[PDB]
From Swiss-Prot, chains A, C:
The record marks 84, 117 as: Involved in dimerization of the capsid protein. It comes from Ross river virus (strain T48). A motif (Nuclear export signal) lies at residues 41-51. The very N-terminus also plays a role in the particle assembly process. The N-terminus also contains a nuclear localization signal and a supra nuclear export signal (supraNES), which is an unusually strong NES that mediates host CRM1 binding in the absence of RanGTP and thus can bind CRM1, not only in the nucleus, but also in the cytoplasm. The C-terminus functions as a protease during translation to cleave itself from the translating structural polyprotein. Residues 80-90, 116-120 are annotated as: Dimerization of the capsid protein. Disulfide bonds join 10-25. It comes from the Viruses. Homodimer. Homomultimer. Interacts with host karyopherin KPNA4; this interaction allows the nuclear import of the viral capsid protein. Interacts with spike glycoprotein E2. Interacts with host IRAK1; the interaction leads to inhibition of IRAK1-dependent signaling. This is Capsid protein. Residues 10-158 form the Peptidase S3 domain. Forms an icosahedral capsid with a T=4 symmetry composed of 240 copies of the capsid protein surrounded by a lipid membrane through which penetrate 80 spikes composed of trimers of E1-E2 heterodimers. The capsid protein binds to the viral RNA genome at a site adjacent to a ribosome binding site for viral genome translation following genome release. Possesses a protease activity that results in its autocatalytic cleavage from the nascent structural protein. Residues 1-10 are annotated as: Ribosome-binding. Residues 52-57 are annotated as: Interaction with spike glycoprotein E2. The chain holds residues 113 to 270 of 1254 of the full protein.
């Protein structure tokens, strides 16, 4: 349950054609969205913003309104080896790869945060590989200074 | 005769350079392809034209 | 005791003229097969691969299929002095020399992993020498970065 506060304070929906295409989140002072997720943000306070882009990191960011910084989630750059909490289950971080039981992550479903044992967001999940019983996440995650993208080959871009 | 001989020596010496550089590439990069967790240092990957 | 749970799906058997010749193991994202182990894998998903073999390390490796990474074994570069696990008996490690009770090694049988006390593949056995009662293995160990084939004098490729 412990992350259900940070989940609800961070997550925003991205929806189109009558269905949720994916999600956005308030991370630090950034609104995060995957660039492949098509649609509009549920909140006018975010939908009116103008965003940076990257086709390489597959990421969009904008500076969030000053009031929304009260709700925005605390982040971390650390990735100890082990497992991490997520909306559908516990993400394992085996050997530096985020991985999940197959069938947990759904089509769409991307842009969700992944949380550490302290509720800090550590990664954003894109699609994921059809890695047998243990689907592997395509993930965006940051160091002290730089964003990075991890992309297991055979990813299907859910 | 002389031109065909010399141009065959030219092609053979070019092929020997190609085979020696290909052998150097194979000798250098193969350990990083065998080792399970390894990845080439990116500078060496640019130098040796690594396939990633 | 427990490592056979992992060995049963890291290993695939290599078969020639209708009989076993040795093994291949899924280690990380790569399948490890000795080059002296002639024949083909009993699984078409591995037999279809192209292997970047080397005569220096007596080893052939290929990037394993998208799905098979589900079941591939965790590796480590950690080689602490101590006790290690293997199919026919317990390995002892001594200053770099893996060693085994003589007669536990058998013809073929190359390509089994050795597991550490955490269930991680430390290296792949290739054979061993007649070091009296305590045969010493010619297992191909690996460092953080590089395979480092080990071979004692008097090896036979059992």
């Amino acid at each position: 349950r412990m992350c259900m506060k940070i989940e609800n304070d961070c997550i925003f929906e991205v929806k189109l054609d009558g269905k949720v295409t994916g999600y956005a989140c308030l991370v630090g002072d950034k609104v995060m969205k995957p660039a492949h997720v098509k649609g509009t943000i549920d909140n006018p306070d975010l939908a009116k913003l103008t965003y940076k882009k990257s086709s390489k990191y597959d990421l969009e960011c904008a500076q969030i309104p000053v009031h929304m910084k009260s709700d925005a989630s605390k982040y971390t750059h650390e990735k100890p080896e082990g497992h991490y909490n997520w909306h559908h289950g516990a993400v394992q971080y085996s050997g530096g790869r985020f991985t999940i039981p197959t069938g947990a992550g759904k089509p769409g479903d991307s842009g969700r945060p992944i949380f550490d044992n302290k509720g800090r967001v550590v990664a954003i999940v894109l699609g994921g590989a059809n890695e047998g019983a243990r689907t592997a996440l395509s993930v965006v995650t940051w160091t002290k200074d730089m964003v990075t993208r991890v992309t297991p080959e055979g990813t299907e871009e859910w | 005769a002389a031109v065909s001989g010399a141009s065959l020596m030219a092609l053979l010496t070019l092929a020997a350079t190609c085979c020696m550089l290909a052998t150097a590439r194979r000798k250098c990069l193969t350990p990083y392809a065998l080792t399970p967790g390894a990845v080439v240092p990116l500078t060496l990957g640019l130098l040796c034209c690594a396939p990633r």
